[PDB]
Design an enzyme around this catalytic site. Sequence first.
Site, PDB file in Angstrom:
ATOM      1  N   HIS A 187       9.298   4.517  -3.658  1.00 21.61           N
ATOM      2  CA  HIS A 187       8.245   3.894  -4.482  1.00 21.61           C
ATOM      3  C   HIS A 187       7.459   5.005  -5.186  1.00 21.61           C
ATOM      4  O   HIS A 187       7.163   4.790  -6.361  1.00 21.61           O
ATOM      5  CB  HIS A 187       7.327   3.019  -3.623  1.00 21.61           C
ATOM      6  CG  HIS A 187       6.052   2.639  -4.302  1.00 21.61           C
ATOM      7  ND1 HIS A 187       5.812   1.374  -4.771  1.00 21.61           N
ATOM      8  CD2 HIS A 187       4.929   3.359  -4.585  1.00 21.61           C
ATOM      9  CE1 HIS A 187       4.613   1.324  -5.325  1.00 21.61           C
ATOM     10  NE2 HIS A 187       4.063   2.523  -5.215  1.00 21.61           N
ATOM     11  N   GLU A 188       7.132   6.110  -4.539  1.00 19.56           N
ATOM     12  CA  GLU A 188       6.380   7.193  -5.156  1.00 19.56           C
ATOM     13  C   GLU A 188       7.157   7.929  -6.253  1.00 19.56           C
ATOM     14  O   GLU A 188       6.573   8.220  -7.296  1.00 19.56           O
ATOM     15  CB  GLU A 188       5.887   8.276  -4.179  1.00 19.56           C
ATOM     16  CG  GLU A 188       4.849   7.836  -3.153  1.00 19.56           C
ATOM     17  CD  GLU A 188       3.716   7.009  -3.717  1.00 19.56           C
ATOM     18  OE1 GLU A 188       3.273   6.025  -3.076  1.00 19.56           O
ATOM     19  OE2 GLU A 188       3.221   7.326  -4.826  1.00 19.56           O
ATOM     20  N   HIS A 191       6.729   6.465  -9.443  1.00 18.08           N
ATOM     21  CA  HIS A 191       5.604   6.935 -10.258  1.00 18.08           C
ATOM     22  C   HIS A 191       5.901   8.295 -10.899  1.00 18.08           C
ATOM     23  O   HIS A 191       5.512   8.594 -12.033  1.00 18.08           O
ATOM     24  CB  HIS A 191       4.321   7.074  -9.423  1.00 18.08           C
ATOM     25  CG  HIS A 191       3.809   5.757  -8.925  1.00 18.08           C
ATOM     26  ND1 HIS A 191       3.717   4.637  -9.709  1.00 18.08           N
ATOM     27  CD2 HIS A 191       3.358   5.406  -7.688  1.00 18.08           C
ATOM     28  CE1 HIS A 191       3.211   3.647  -8.993  1.00 18.08           C
ATOM     29  NE2 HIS A 191       2.995   4.092  -7.764  1.00 18.08           N
ATOM     30  N   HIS A 239       2.575   0.391 -11.255  1.00 12.12           N
ATOM     31  CA  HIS A 239       2.823  -0.723 -10.350  1.00 12.12           C
ATOM     32  C   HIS A 239       3.300  -1.976 -11.079  1.00 12.12           C
ATOM     33  O   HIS A 239       2.842  -2.307 -12.168  1.00 12.12           O
ATOM     34  CB  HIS A 239       1.578  -0.996  -9.496  1.00 12.12           C
ATOM     35  CG  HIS A 239       1.320   0.077  -8.486  1.00 12.12           C
ATOM     36  ND1 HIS A 239       0.074   0.595  -8.217  1.00 12.12           N
ATOM     37  CD2 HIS A 239       2.183   0.741  -7.672  1.00 12.12           C
ATOM     38  CE1 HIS A 239       0.184   1.519  -7.276  1.00 12.12           C
ATOM     39  NE2 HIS A 239       1.462   1.641  -6.926  1.00 12.12           N
TER      40      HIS A 239
HETATM   41  C1  LIG Z   1       0.371  -4.481   3.681  1.00 11.60           C
HETATM   42  O1  LIG Z   1       0.636  -3.102   3.356  1.00 11.60           O
HETATM   43  C2  LIG Z   1      -0.345  -2.359   2.810  1.00 11.60           C
HETATM   44  O2  LIG Z   1      -1.217  -2.883   2.145  1.00 11.60           O
HETATM   45  C3  LIG Z   1      -0.397  -0.864   3.013  1.00 11.60           C
HETATM   46  N1  LIG Z   1      -1.109  -0.210   1.923  1.00 11.60           N
HETATM   47  C4  LIG Z   1      -0.598  -0.179   0.677  1.00 11.60           C
HETATM   48  O3  LIG Z   1       0.456  -0.722   0.403  1.00 11.60           O
HETATM   49  C5  LIG Z   1      -1.362   0.538  -0.408  1.00 11.60           C
HETATM   50  N2  LIG Z   1      -0.412   1.231  -1.291  1.00 11.60           N
HETATM   51  C6  LIG Z   1      -0.308   2.572  -1.274  1.00 11.60           C
HETATM   52  O4  LIG Z   1      -0.993   3.249  -0.525  1.00 11.60           O
HETATM   53  C7  LIG Z   1       0.662   3.234  -2.252  1.00 11.60           C
HETATM   54  C8  LIG Z   1      -0.074   3.504  -3.597  1.00 11.60           C
HETATM   55  S1  LIG Z   1       1.083   4.392  -4.724  1.00 11.60           S
HETATM   56  N3  LIG Z   1       1.840   2.320  -2.512  1.00 11.60           N
HETATM   57  C9  LIG Z   1       2.944   2.733  -1.600  1.00 11.60           C
HETATM   58  C10 LIG Z   1       4.070   1.701  -1.485  1.00 11.60           C
HETATM   59  C11 LIG Z   1       5.330   2.090  -0.998  1.00 11.60           C
HETATM   60  C12 LIG Z   1       6.350   1.159  -0.873  1.00 11.60           C
HETATM   61  C13 LIG Z   1       6.169  -0.188  -1.228  1.00 11.60           C
HETATM   62  C14 LIG Z   1       7.214  -1.116  -1.090  1.00 11.60           C
HETATM   63  C15 LIG Z   1       7.392  -2.118  -2.050  1.00 11.60           C
HETATM   64  C16 LIG Z   1       8.412  -3.068  -1.918  1.00 11.60           C
HETATM   65  C17 LIG Z   1       9.285  -3.013  -0.838  1.00 11.60           C
HETATM   66  C18 LIG Z   1       9.107  -2.019   0.134  1.00 11.60           C
HETATM   67  C19 LIG Z   1       8.071  -1.093   0.020  1.00 11.60           C
HETATM   68  C20 LIG Z   1       4.916  -0.580  -1.722  1.00 11.60           C
HETATM   69  C21 LIG Z   1       3.887   0.368  -1.845  1.00 11.60           C
HETATM   70  C22 LIG Z   1      -1.031  -0.410   4.372  1.00 11.60           C
HETATM   71  C23 LIG Z   1      -2.366  -1.166   4.649  1.00 11.60           C
HETATM   72  C24 LIG Z   1       0.006  -0.627   5.514  1.00 11.60           C
HETATM   73 ZN   LIG Z   2       2.171   3.078  -6.028  1.00 13.88          ZN
END
Ligand SMILES: COC(=O)[C@@H](NC(=O)CNC(=O)[C@H](CS)NCc1ccc(-c2ccccc2)cc1)C(C)C
Ligand SMILES: [Zn+2]
EC number: 3.4.24.17
Lengths: 173, 170
Positions: free
Chosen positions: A119-120, A123, A129
């Site tokens: 995912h990173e 970017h 997003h």
């Molecule tokens: C429910 O999950 C969350 O909200 C988590 N936080 C986040 O997602 C906040 N996002 C972040 O901190 C970073 C900003 S660049 N996003 C990373 C990220 C990485 C992978 C996927 C993903 C998407 C689809 C399928 C599988 C995985 C989605 C997001 C944690 C609380 C565990």
């Molecule tokens: Zn992101």
Amino acid sequence: FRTFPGIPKWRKTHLTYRIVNYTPDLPKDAVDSAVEKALKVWEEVTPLTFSRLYEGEADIMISFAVREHGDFYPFDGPGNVLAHAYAPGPGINGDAHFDDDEQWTKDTTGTNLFLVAAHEIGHSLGLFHSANTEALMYPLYHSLTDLTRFRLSQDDINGIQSLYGPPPDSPET
Amino acid sequence: FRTFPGIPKWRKTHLTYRIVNYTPDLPKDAVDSAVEKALKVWEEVTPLTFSRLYEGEADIMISFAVREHGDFYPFDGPGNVLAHAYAPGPGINGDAHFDDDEQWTKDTTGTNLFLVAAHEIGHSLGLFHSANTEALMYPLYHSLTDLTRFRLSQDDINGIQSLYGPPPDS
Ligand SMILES: COC(=O)[C@@H](NC(=O)CNC(=O)[C@H](CS)NCc1ccc(-c2ccccc2)cc1)C(C)C
Ligand SMILES: [Zn+2]
Ligand SMILES: [Ca+2]
Ligand SMILES: [Ca+2]
Ligand SMILES: [Ca+2]
Ligand SMILES: [Ca+2]
Ligand SMILES: [Ca+2]
Ligand SMILES: [Ca+2]
Ligand SMILES: [Zn+2]
Ligand SMILES: [Zn+2]
Ligand SMILES: [Zn+2]
């Protein structure tokens, strides 16, 4: 899908990456493999190729960080923000940082490093997003037992191909 | 020997440490080992004891970094500054950072991790630089130490003991 303002993108097809430091969470080879696998995801659907550097400046500098770490956005402790990456360009641009206050894993018992890495790098290559809940670029992570059957969503492919097109070696349906 | 001004020192004998990240230059066991051996140097001649944490804030937070890393004192590329550590206290105080623009080694082919870690912990425990060229805390220790026959000098023992005493029931 969505790009960053001005649609910044690499003007080269071959990028370098470097794993700058290692997390206490996994063995070094496991970090390497999830990064290799994460890059391979993007490589398969575009002309982009990747090589690793063991020294010097790589386009994509990869590291693990905790809290304040030398850039404008300090990490935030266990949970919430998992990592961040910078759109394409010189220096800190293109780099990816991973919050080590997270427990990085090879499966979904903690925060899957491969998935966050793919995912990173998304970017790092210029995708912002996605609003599409099925996309990898969706801002919310979710634990998915399915790492053996991982597939980029059509929304992702479309977004990355709008930037770089498909692989020159592949037919288009 | 010398101590920092106002002689800041731990007010307790059990100190926790944590290895926050790992350098590409060595196997993680080589990092752990060198860090443990550096800690042992000081523990052996004082009442101080150490224990490892893998989460939370440890007294002595250990990390590798390059250039600007979240404190006011950026690293400077290869050579010269190899690492830095803060004197005893809360937060960042007591922590030690190691320049990954150096090539950390188990032996002497690069910059020896054990040696530099032993010096830096000396600072994390309250010793400032020594005027004795034979001391581990001498600024040029890394260029003047013979690793085969390494032992803490008595100036280093005098100094760490001035702060914390000899090991219990010597
Ligand atoms: C429910 O999950 C969350 O909200 C988590 N936080 C986040 O997602 C906040 N996002 C972040 O901190 C970073 C900003 S660049 N996003 C990373 C990220 C990485 C992978 C996927 C993903 C998407 C689809 C399928 C599988 C995985 C989605 C997001 C944690 C609380 C565990
Ligand atoms: Zn992101
Ligand atoms: Ca970069
Ligand atoms: Ca976090
Ligand atoms: Ca972690
Ligand atoms: Ca501290
Ligand atoms: Ca240096
Ligand atoms: Ca290094
Ligand atoms: Zn960052
Ligand atoms: Zn520092
Ligand atoms: Zn010093």
